[PDB]
A = this chain, B = another copy of it.
């Protein structure tokens, strides 16, 4: 009596017709957001290249490839890059760029494949390991805690760590959600990796479940040719002391750990409130 009937199952597609909600207004502005990646900051490039070079890294795994934009810098600079992502919609962009650039030998050797943190050990044979694994741009916080005990967080971080060769590097970040939770507000424009060209106004919604922070949901209203349209994304608010604990546990404690606040050294109680924390772990070996 109350049942509803779909024309096609959730998740299925067909020749000649766009995929489900592919062409909606939220999707359209979201696409402008993920493309707002044209200006890589000098300090980002200089910091990452410096840290990879300082450790002699050659073989790099990017486990949050997205559109490829972090991985493309490394390809251009002569690293042997493998890049993976669980999201096909985002990988589509990385693959397209690689295809356009395929006559450049460095791009012909760029590996791009579907993989999920939760199955990474299977989806990507480690061999002996990578020299560096990177997970930057606050991508780790895209994974929610839908079971309630952060067991998925721990599995994902363990699998990401298992990709690092002994003596190798993991570099993994999060936005400063300690500040977001204390103020209730996640302001726009602060991406330290790519300088934003897109003008965005953000509403921040924080869900607390029995007094424990559970989700941060950001509603973006983006001015476009004029025009004025909205999309929504959500994030797990990782706080610094928990993530410090988690990321070291993923290695069995067999790691040296340090934390940066926006590319610079971080020490508690410093005047400067970083936008992002960047954890750097050298696995024992």
Contacts and interface: CB of A to CB of B under 8 A. Distances in A.
A33 to B, nearest CB: 9
How many copies make up the complex? 4
A162 interface: no
Interface in A12-51: 12-24, 26-27, 30, 34
A183 B65 CA distance: 40
B209 A13 contact: no
A88 B99 contact: no
A26 B7 CA distance: 13
A217 interface: yes
Which size bracket describes the interface of A in this complex? 35 or more
Nearest to A10: B21
Contacts of A85: 15-16
Given A184-B211, A205-B208, A1 B15 contact: no
A6 B232 contact: yes
A87 to B, nearest CB: 4
A17 B89 contact: no
A54 interface: no
A203 B148 CA distance: 12
A137 B15 contact: yes
A117 interface: yes
Given A7-B234, A10-B24, A27-B9, A17 B143 contact: yes
Max count, chain B CB within 10 A of own CB: residue among A21, A87, A184 = A87
A14 B142 contact: yes
A3 interface: yes
A102 B112 CA distance: 15
A233 B204 CA distance: 23
B5 A4 contact: yes
Contacts of A1: 7-8, 14, 17-18, 20, 142-144, 146
Nearest to A34: B13
Max count, chain B CB within 10 A of own CB: residue among A1, A4, A135 = A1
Contacts of A8: 1-2, 231-234
A239 B58 CA distance: 58
17 contacts: A1-B18, A1-B142, A1-B144, A2-B7, A7-B232, A9-B30, A13-B30, A13-B90, A15-B85, A16-B139, A18-B86, A18-B116, A92-B92, A183-B211, A205-B214, A206-B208, A208-B208
